[PDB]
Amino acid sequence: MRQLLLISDLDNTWVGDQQALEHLQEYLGDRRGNFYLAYATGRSYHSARELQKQVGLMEPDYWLTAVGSEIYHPEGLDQHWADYLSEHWQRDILQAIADGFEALKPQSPLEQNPWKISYHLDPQACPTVIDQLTEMLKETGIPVQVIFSSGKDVDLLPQRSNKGNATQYLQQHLAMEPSQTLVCGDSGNDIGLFETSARGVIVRNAQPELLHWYDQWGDSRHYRAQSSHAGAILEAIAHFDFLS
Ligand SMILES: OC[C@H]1O[C@@](CO)(O[C@H]2O[C@H](CO)[C@@H](O)[C@H](O)[C@H]2O)[C@@H](O)[C@@H]1O
Numbered sequence: 001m002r003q004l005l006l007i008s009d010l011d012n013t014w015v016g017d018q019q020a021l022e023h024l025q026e027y028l029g030d031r032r033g034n035f036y037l038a039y040a041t042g043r044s045y046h047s048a049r050e051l052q053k054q055v056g057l058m059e060p061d062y063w064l065t066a067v068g069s070e071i072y073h074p075e076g077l078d079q080h081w082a083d084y085l086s087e088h089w090q091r092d093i094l095q096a097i098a099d100g101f102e103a104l105k106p107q108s109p110l111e112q113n114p115w116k117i118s119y120h121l122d123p124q125a126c127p128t129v130i131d132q133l134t135e136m137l138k139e140t141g142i143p144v145q146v147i148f149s150s151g152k153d154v155d156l157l158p159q160r161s162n163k164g165n166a167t168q169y170l171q172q173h174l175a176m177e178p179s180q181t182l183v184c185g186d187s188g189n190d191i192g193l194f195e196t197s198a199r200g201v202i203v204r205n206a207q208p209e210l211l212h213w214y215d216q217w218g219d220s221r222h223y224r225a226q227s228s229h230a231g232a233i234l235e236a237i238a239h240f241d242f243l244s
């Protein structure tokens with residue numbers, strides 16, 4: 001029932017340029033009831049909440065955490081989403097495979113959750129190993145996704161759990177149309193958002209994976225901002241003429 005569904009990544013997108021963050025929130029703050037805000041981050045809910053205390057993120061309506069593997073309404077975790085991602089998902093098998101790669105190192109236990117298996121790719125390792133990993137995991141019957149961002153972070157998620165599917169779920173939950181949605185990303189863990197038919201903005205300081213993705217799949221609904229960080233969101237909002 002609001003005119004805009006704003007979905008944005010936190011690190012390097014919304015957060016990063018403190019001044020931009022501040023004038024972005026000052027702008028949105030004056031029409032807060034005109035849009036639903038969702039932070040689609042790769043951080044765990046607890047980690048997202050910490051960042052908010054640190055930089056002062058404005059309170060969102062929903063939290064799409066851990067790359068969309070955990071959605072949080074004010075009331076709490078969306079148990080429907082959790083049960084939806086749980087189907088046909090065998091975390092243990094996938095992890096056994098991933099652990100097998102010498103180039104992959106497990107990320108802290110706190111970066112892990114029932115539907116997210118994260119690793120760090122060795123800086124000296126050849127990235128093509130991630131394609132090797134992807135097909136190896138994909139060839140198990142298990143519906144998996146491999147998210148590779150910033151050249152090091154690797155995330156194994158259910159095939160129906162990236163930020164893009166979380167967003168689509170949210171659009172249906174809110175009865176918000178794709179033309180009313182704006183997704184803001186900066187890295188490879190944001191590609192899912194841009195695979196959505198929602199208007200999107202790629203921040204200037206975007207990661208190579210995303211810039212590369214934009215070169216091959218970038219459509220007219222996708223906008224490459226000149227501004228970096230939160231400034232890109234204002235730029236996009238003005239661009240797609242949202243919140244007229
Ligand atoms: O935005 C990149 C930046 O986010 C961090 C924050 O801790 O990592 C999050 O996003 C990664 C990619 O989605 C996940 O693999 C990771 O588990 C999650 O915490 C930084 O590590 C990263 O540089």
Ligand SMILES: [Mg+2]
Binds near residue numbers: 011185187188189190
């Ligand atoms: Mg990102």
